[PDB]
Amino acid sequence: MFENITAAPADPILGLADLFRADERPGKINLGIGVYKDETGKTPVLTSVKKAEQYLLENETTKNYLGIDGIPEFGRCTQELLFGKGSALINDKRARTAQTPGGTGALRVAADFLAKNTSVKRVWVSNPSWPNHKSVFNSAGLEVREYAYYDAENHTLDFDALINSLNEAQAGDVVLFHGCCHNPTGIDPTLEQWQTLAQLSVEKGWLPLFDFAYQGFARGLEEDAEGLRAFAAMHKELIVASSYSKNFGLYNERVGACTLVAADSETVDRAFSQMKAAIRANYSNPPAHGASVVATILSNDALRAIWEQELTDMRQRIQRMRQLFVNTLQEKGANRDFSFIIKQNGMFSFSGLTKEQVLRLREEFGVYAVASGRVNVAGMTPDNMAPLCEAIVAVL
């Protein structure tokens, strides 16, 4: 039955490193991998998680199954991280959280939930946006419609085009936001824009679905939640898919959550039972390790403090690499102006390179980057910044 199967095409991101891991070229920079790398170009395991793993190794007495929703302390903590402490929806018990295999499994879980328990047919993802969004939503049978976003000229957020594009979206439609550090533009709404987006959202009656994966990478854990908090303040219902892959360096342990906010405790339980149903049919229960490492780190003040410092070292390092990048380019020599780069949050930014330039780079200079011209700033070290900018300026 497999003799006629069509070979799948390469993923726009993976198929980059998978090839990178073949181009011997000495000096081969890589800016694809939306994974963080320190000043050494290494993706270490945070000390806090390292300490948490020792504690676990010593205390765990069993591997017996977790509830379908995962670890209680986990859900509770992510709740407070997202909605805040003393947040109404917390105190009222309007939310329910489920531990899932990473932020993607939270998406797939939201999708399947929606897809079989509601009258949702379309999802509105921005343009551009993390590629896998569409694939995930489509696999559930849902339709994906793009709302404009990037001002290719001024290198900014085109609020006008956005709203104008969003208006066509009907009520009862899911509009997907990026809590912070927009993949791949790095441009995020201001609180003001967010605050209006939350108003026009209740009116038109969309169903928010925040994809929060880089909390703490723009301005800090709390500041980064302003948006999700603005909507949460206004809506009776919402969904949020968060991931601990980055802000915790837990990439391969697949740890994230899917938080259902409904209008009242009574219904949030009903809606959640069906969510659990989706999960039970997908993977049964989530993986305990990475989640346990997160519950303990967050419920322990010594460990949380160390962690909370590591996150900011990461955050601060990427922000040093942004301006170093701007300055270095402006130094090598030529007409240009990448000052906008300094205004974008997170690990990514839109280089503003043509698909062609990008190939001249990753083939004549081995400097790898994603076709869209997206470059992972958190993969830049002070030692590769020179040949890098040389390559770039050379292809301008």
Added chain:
Amino acid sequence: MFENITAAPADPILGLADLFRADERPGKINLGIGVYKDETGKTPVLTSVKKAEQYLLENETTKNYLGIDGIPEFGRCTQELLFGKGSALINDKRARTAQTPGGTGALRVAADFLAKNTSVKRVWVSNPSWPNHKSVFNSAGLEVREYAYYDAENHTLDFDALINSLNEAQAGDVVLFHGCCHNPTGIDPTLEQWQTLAQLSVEKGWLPLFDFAYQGFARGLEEDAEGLRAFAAMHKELIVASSYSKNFGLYNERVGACTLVAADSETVDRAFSQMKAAIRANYSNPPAHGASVVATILSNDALRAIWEQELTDMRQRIQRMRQLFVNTLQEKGANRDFSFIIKQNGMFSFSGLTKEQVLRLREEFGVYAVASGRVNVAGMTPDNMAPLCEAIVAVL
């Protein structure tokens, strides 16, 4: 949009312990939880895995993402465990293995694969069979059709009814087997029966889908693979979903594999790329921990030896509990005869209790069991065997 959601009904297995965990009753036995428990009624973490976790804790230098298919050594090892060493399909390179979140995620992965890349509409699950099978297959959009299995009278495998029921299944249909320790009957085909089932399978042209979750619990790692090996010898293509949850006590780490056997290396790669595609849309990459604990334990001879001994202590303990159960019942006093219990493999067996008896037990005697009258033998200790059999005999 959630105000009219229908509250999901309770799962036939979970909703048992979830209530058990509320019935204070001193002496409250529990036979639901298809999870293993030692002579103390504890589900410990094996020593081998404990040692493997220390090694990991010391050596792991990164948490960076795994390939979509998981850990190479993992896939390679599970391959040799399943098909054998020097097995043609291994040497020929006709198989591809992907690490998934437990045996269930392997199922869901096979399903989604089939569901979108082939002309498969129906799956044939036995009667009875692990409940979640249907839910999983249905969530993918596939149809589930039951083929007879249990001889409620003689307490045996009704080969006749089976074949007779299977014949209606068309070609290009997926027939799902249980490699060993049939949930919930404990009755498994003989090699002879298996060997014929493999012949009639090629003719009618079904597409095998073995659900292997209790390897090593019937007669030992190798003996337990006779079946999957019989089919593998005969078919050009097959799929197998294995789980390390039991034979490794890794329940909550979600570690299993989905092995695609095709007719040749060239196509198995094509078929696999699409499988990876399904995964990428579901959870992206698998959880590394539990899988790492398994690769190292199996690739290290000292650790494998310790583990390989632990598995047999478990296997041997359940087999002591079967005959102790038979003898004790026959001792308390009454017309009956549970000798068939001694002939069933694995942790389960069909008590042969009416839904009524089962309620008299778990409500007048607090002795919990699944409505079907399925009882987890690996939850019986020499210390609870007395009141247990008293309860049972009392409801005969």
